[PDB]
Amino acid sequence: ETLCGGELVDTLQFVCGDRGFYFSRPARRSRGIVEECCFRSCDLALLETYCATP
Amino acid sequence: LCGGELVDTLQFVCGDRGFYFSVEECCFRSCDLALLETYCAT
Amino acid sequence: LCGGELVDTLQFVCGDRGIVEECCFRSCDLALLETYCATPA
Amino acid sequence: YPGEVCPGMDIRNNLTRLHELENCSVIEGHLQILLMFKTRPEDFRDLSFPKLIMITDYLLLFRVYGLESLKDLFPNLTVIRGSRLFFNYALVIFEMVHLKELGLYNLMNITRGSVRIEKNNELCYLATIDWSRILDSVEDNYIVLNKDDNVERCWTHSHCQKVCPTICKSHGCTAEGLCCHSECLGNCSQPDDPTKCVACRNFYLDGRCVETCPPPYYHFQDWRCVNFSFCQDLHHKCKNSRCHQYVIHNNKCIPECPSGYTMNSSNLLCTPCLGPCPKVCHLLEGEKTIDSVTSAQELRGCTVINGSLIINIRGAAELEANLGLIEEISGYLKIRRSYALVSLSFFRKLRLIRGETLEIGNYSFYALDNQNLRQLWDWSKHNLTITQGKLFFHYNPKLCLSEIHKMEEVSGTKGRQERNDIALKTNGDQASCENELLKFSYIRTSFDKILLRWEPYWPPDFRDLLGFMLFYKEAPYQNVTEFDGQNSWTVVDIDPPLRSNSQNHPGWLMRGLKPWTQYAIFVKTLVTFSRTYGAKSDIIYVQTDATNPSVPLDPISVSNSSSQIILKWKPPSDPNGNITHYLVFWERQAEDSELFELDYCLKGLKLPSRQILKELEESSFRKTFEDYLHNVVFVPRHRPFEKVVNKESLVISGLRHFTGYRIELQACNQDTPEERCSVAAYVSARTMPEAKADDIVGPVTHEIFENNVVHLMWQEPKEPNGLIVLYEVSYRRYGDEELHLCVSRKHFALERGCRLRGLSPGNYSVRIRATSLAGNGSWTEPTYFYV
Amino acid sequence: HLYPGEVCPGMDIRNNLTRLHELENCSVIEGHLQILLMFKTRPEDFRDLSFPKLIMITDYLLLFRVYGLESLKDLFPNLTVIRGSRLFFNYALVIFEMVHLKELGLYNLMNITRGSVRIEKNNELCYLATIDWSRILDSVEDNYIVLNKDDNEECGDICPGNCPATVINGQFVERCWTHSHCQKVCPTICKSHGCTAEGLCCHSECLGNCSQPDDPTKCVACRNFYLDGRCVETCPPPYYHFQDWRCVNFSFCQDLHHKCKNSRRQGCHQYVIHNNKCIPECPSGYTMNSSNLLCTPCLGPCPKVCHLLEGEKTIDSVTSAQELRGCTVINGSLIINIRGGNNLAAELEANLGLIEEISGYLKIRRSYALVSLSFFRKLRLIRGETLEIGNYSFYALDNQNLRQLWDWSKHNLTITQGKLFFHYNPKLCLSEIHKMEEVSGTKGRQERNDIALKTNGDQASCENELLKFSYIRTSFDKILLRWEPYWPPDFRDLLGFMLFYKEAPYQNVTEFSWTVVDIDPPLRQNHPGWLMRGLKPWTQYAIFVKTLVTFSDERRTYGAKSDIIYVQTDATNPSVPLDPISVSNSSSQIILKWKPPSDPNGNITHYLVFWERQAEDSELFELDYCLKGLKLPSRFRKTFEDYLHNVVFVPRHRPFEKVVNKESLVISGLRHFTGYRIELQACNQDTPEERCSVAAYVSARTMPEAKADDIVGPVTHEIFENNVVHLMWQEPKEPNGLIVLYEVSYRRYGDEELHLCVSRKHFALERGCRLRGLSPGNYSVRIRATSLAGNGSWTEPTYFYV
């Protein structure tokens, strides 16, 4: 199952939920979210890695 | 095309389900079976 | 155009000098019209 | 006959070539003389053709200057048979100058056709020519714009028309007027002599006129008899010439075998032709190119092509009509740079192509630079074979490779092709065949409307989809092609369904249509390329159910008898289903009661009797902004009636004479479950009146008073033509005139007939006639009484 | 006023409002402010928050899915100007997927220096059509506002308006932000200087708003520069500019440069000085000096290399290109991909253009709004070391509007390695591609199907050669044309001429409806030529021809075309006159109304009209007008000649007047109550062999008179011995048309009155009338004449005794 924008945020804050999303500093690198979840299907670990605390 | 002459279409689309009045969106706007589906109440 | 009215065309394009089956039934293209001029008339 | 064959030929621009006719006797053809402008009469008094006798096809004269009498040039011209009629005519003379008289005293008869004379300001002696004696038909002539219009029969001032007696209708009259032979026509050297006939009425044979052609001689041009040898020689002469290829059928040397007949190599007979069996068309260069409708006009009726065809249409149904009768091509087929070719459907009946002559590169089918080409054929059913050769497919932007793959799988040329024979990246660049099926969930129909709902579909990125497109049209029969002309197929756009994350089906309901029809519907997706993920469904055929039919058409009722009324009508404009029957109601129309209170005896005695890239770009722009935002943001760690069946007319009996009747007519296309009957059509019809109804029946009873007062009591015809408005009384006394009186309905009712007072002494009479709606009836018997 | 508060560099808030309190004491933001990803919030949590101190934002403001927010008017009550130094995808203010947001509430924002506003996918936002962006932005068309509550639904923007209103397209509408505030509009004289409440103009340097009119010291934001509260257009030394919005002393720039150098932050820049500006790094041709931070011009041509991550970068927006600003040599590849619909050339050539060399390849894909590659102003070399896949260097794909590729009259170029590639450029001519093929020097490095022969310029006009119309003739409806022949080097290349024509009422007709005719090529004098058909007379038509040639890949045959030629067909007989109606307003006058012909066929010179008097029916003089029904009315072969010429030819006075410019006619001097025939025609040419149309016919009867029906003359009687009275009376010899009968009403003295009929034949044949069987006694006879119009006047009673 490949999920794309619009619904992707709704998928977020549910798998992630509760805590926020990690954001330190810009410091695009061309592999952010859409070519990782919309272009190709992504598992739960990739979505989890965008959480803040865990 | 709206209220009065569209009642046949409303009873057509949902069959025996009934509806509640309001049509201002079909003789100035158009009917597209989406509003006709949601207008009929189960 | 057709018989009678194609006469205006052939006085038009010929100047000072088959039919009807080619312009009534078929298209009228000036390709046959010009070469139908009767020079030794 | 001393002379030459003399094939038909024309003389123009001078009179020199006319001398070529000096050594001729019988013309086997038509003569056409026109455009003599530099001509003078004195140059034509030394020219004559006494040897010329017989003209086969027809004769045309136009714009002749100088000629005044044709008796010199054509002295002995006998008969114009009109074997080849110039549009039902055999002689056309138009726009003559200086031509004053006909001169042709030697024209007796024309076998078929008529004459056309027009715009001859000088021609005269037209009132002394008998066309009935000459031509068997005189109703087709058209002789106007001549000098005569602007009895003895004579051609010229010195030559008569040789007026034959009524017996010699076609035999002909000699110098003494005696009838000639039956085969003799118009004139004869000796009366009743077939050998001495100047002309042959039916057929000619070695100086003798005969009615028919005995075998082995066949009827040649319906004018002579020619054997098989000469006819076959003429056919061979045409065989190695440019043509009228002579064939023999029904003992006739006809220029072509008629419908359903085939030329046989062994014998000149026209055998029955196998099936449609039209023809075979050749190609010396084997490369005739089709540029437009005109170039394909000569291809009408061609089936077998003995060469190669190269289509180049720089442009619809026109080529559909011209083509579609072709089956096999001996050479190769090429289609090159045809802009207005949507599909090769028109090229229907093909099943094999030999390709003996090969396109350079050893190719049998060569398609190149075809832009709008979208389909080749309906390969699911259509069969095509290739005997040998290779295929070429380059620069065909709208033919995806599926059709190319079906090419060799149907033609059996799997191994016949080589690498690069079919281009990969140049064909079907705009064609988006993605062979993703769509299934319709359920469909329901009503007499006015029909509902459509199909299964949902989503590309991998649900934002790519940009609505559906529903195509529909009317399908006459069960088959239809999805590729019509470069039109039709009315379309409606569908908003994409909302992502339900249950599952909603897209669905669509039409708006208005024709009941009881066959509708072809199919749905096509509309997505934006990034790959292509389109989708389409098979052509679904739906049948809208029936309803109340239309009203009957043209209700006409006639009266044929005093009790019989005939009724005729037409089927309704909209049958809306197979019409089961008709319902006819007749109701006796009550007569106008007003006549019962109008005294018509006074004044008023008269009595009536009876464009797209922008939306895709907007969608892509929205999507590419969404992706940019997501990339930047996230970060990892009742009445009498009748049931008429299958009939359009009826006869109704049991009706009183001159009685009005209202007819209510209905059409019912259903019989048992509550017949759906249309609203009726009404018509008022009345029978004719009875002849004896208005006649008074009953002797007149008269009562004489002391003061010569007479009371008249006459029994009215209780069954009149409807009713009696008044009675007319014609009473006459001896020695007096027939005085007249009118007794109204009220006068008859209250006076019990009539009450006349103050009668002069003498013998009176009493004659009374009833006036019904039909008119006056019969006067009563004269009651003679002396007062 | 001054700026009381910190500068609070750019920042974003996520996942809780507790961080938002970092906006406590700052009035200007030196960067971008983002508030996004708010889920566990409700409107009661937002009512408390308010930031009156904040005035101006440097880069942009982005709101993305913040729940529980319904109006920013409480959040941002003093936002005035968005600087837009560094945009966010060529947007300065973004409102994306805002739920519960009912109204913007930014009633105080006035000017956005650079950028655009994009608000979409809200489903709850209205009060949008009641705002005026033209007075807020500079380029309105760059906006993009769709998919809200305003468009699909019908959120009624009820607001005071009291409040100023203005026109947008063709009608006036109020310009209000919320239900309680409206856009502040002031006279255009203060175009951007600002304007106080009463309308007095602010200071010239001022921007947006001010407290004291015409005073820089009392302003809230100024366009040029800021310094020490009282801001000036350009501060003098020792103050150096900074971030285009404020200038600072050298000590500040020096200490921040030291703070960046000692603290090795990955993002900090070694700020230097150049033209009294503390910019992060001066461009090529300068070297930073260790002694003084100002960078001195170097003694050598060392370009400023712009190293590219992963050897590739995609350009899709203004903020994507701005990363390359100031760079002149790229150590990577460039991929132009602008999915747009609005022009982006200006910002591109502002940010790009200083580029000279591309180490990698260049690829322009899917760009829609691109019109020319001219924004690469100073591009000279494409090394192509990082050659693109397929061994291509210059790549182009599906550019729907790429028209001009470069100005080859003056621009140089050089491609070291790789081969070109072009496909699906409908507005690009092959002439430009071949001109690159010559200039770049890659002539020998091209192969098959690397340049599409048909896709490039599918519908364009780049024949670059001209044709001359040798001879043109005009007529009734036929237009004969002949032009000089055109021959390519190989005559087989020519596939045919093709002509276009269209009616041209005006001069302004564009190049390249538009009826098309195909022409077969001529055989190799004999000018190709073609004749016209179905031309409406007296109409101007634009006509021009074109040439169709083969692919011509190896050669350079581009065909030719002639310029637009306007020719007007000659004139002719006009149509029938329209609306012919006739009314009699009097017994002698008649009025005629008509309309100009539907087909004027030329300038209508005049109208002609004939009037005549009809004749009464003869049967009206011998009809019985007192029998029943006496109601007097009141007022094939066609081709037989065709193939005949085929064989012959063989292959080798009523009154009238000239009515000028008037559609109403009045005619006098006519017999009263008489039928009249009117026939009118139109003539569009009078002096040279006057030409007139067909006749439009009508009939009209004049109004009846009164005394005409009435009997004139006394009544005479002659009585015989048998008491038979012959009556003589002169008839009205001038009646309304004619008199059909006379009624004679004769009565006895004290008895009834009887009516006698005297028809025309009764009066003529009998010479008057005769009454028979009249007993002696006084009488009274009146005579009435019944004319066509009606009845006359009864004569005086005839008193006599018989």
Residue numbers in the entry:
A (entry chain D): 6 to 32, 37 to 63
B (entry chain C): 8 to 29, 43 to 62
C (entry chain E): 8 to 24, 41 to 64
D (entry chain A): 3 to 152, 179 to 270, 274 to 346, 351 to 521, 527 to 541, 545 to 573, 577 to 656, 691 to 717, ...
E (entry chain B): 1 to 161, 168 to 518, 528 to 539, 546 to 656, 701 to 717, 756 to 905
What do the paper's sentences say?
The 3D reconstruction of class 2 (determined at 3.8 Å resolution for IR-A/IGF2, comprising 19% of the particles; determined at 4.2 Å resolution for IR-B/IGF2, comprising 22% of the particles) showed an Ƭ-shaped asymmetric conformation with three IGF2 molecules bound. The asymmetric structures of IR-A/IGF2 are nearly identical to that of IR-B/IGF2. In one half of the asymmetric IR/IGF2 complex, the two IGF2 molecules bind to site-1’ in the head of Ƭ-shape and site-2’ in the middle regions of the receptor. In the other half of the asymmetric complex, the third IGF2, located in the middle region of the Ƭ-shaped structure, is sandwiched between site-1 and site-2’ from two adjacent IR protomers. This asymmetric IR/IGF2 complex exhibits similar architecture to the recently reported cryo-EM structure of IR/insulin complex at subsaturated insulin concentrations. Interestingly, in the presence of saturated IGF2, most IR-A (84% of total particles) and IR-B (86% of total particles) particles adopt a Ƭ-shaped asymmetric conformation, distinct from the IR-A particles in response to saturated insulins showing a single T-shaped symmetric conformation. Hence, it is reasonable to speculate that the predominant adoption of asymmetric conformations of IR in response to saturated IGF2 (about 84% and 86% of total particles for IR-A and IR-B, respectively) might result from the comparatively weaker binding of IGF2 at IR site-2. In the asymmetric state, one IGF2 is simultaneously contacting site-1 and site-2’ from two protomers, similar to the IR/insulin complex at subsaturated insulin concentrations. Therefore, it is likely that IGF2’s lower efficiency in promoting the T-shaped IR is due to its comparatively weak IR site-2 binding affinity.
Insulin receptor (IR) is a receptor tyrosine kinase that plays critical roles in cellular signaling, growth, and metabolism. IR can be activated by two highly related ligands – insulin and insulin-like growth factor 2 (IGF2). Consequently, IR-B has an additional 12 amino acids at the C-terminal helix of the alpha subunit (α-CT), while IR-A lacks this segment. Here, we present cryo-EM structures of full-length human long isoform IR (IR-B) in both the inactive and IGF2-bound active states, and short isoform IR (IR-A) in the IGF2-bound active state.
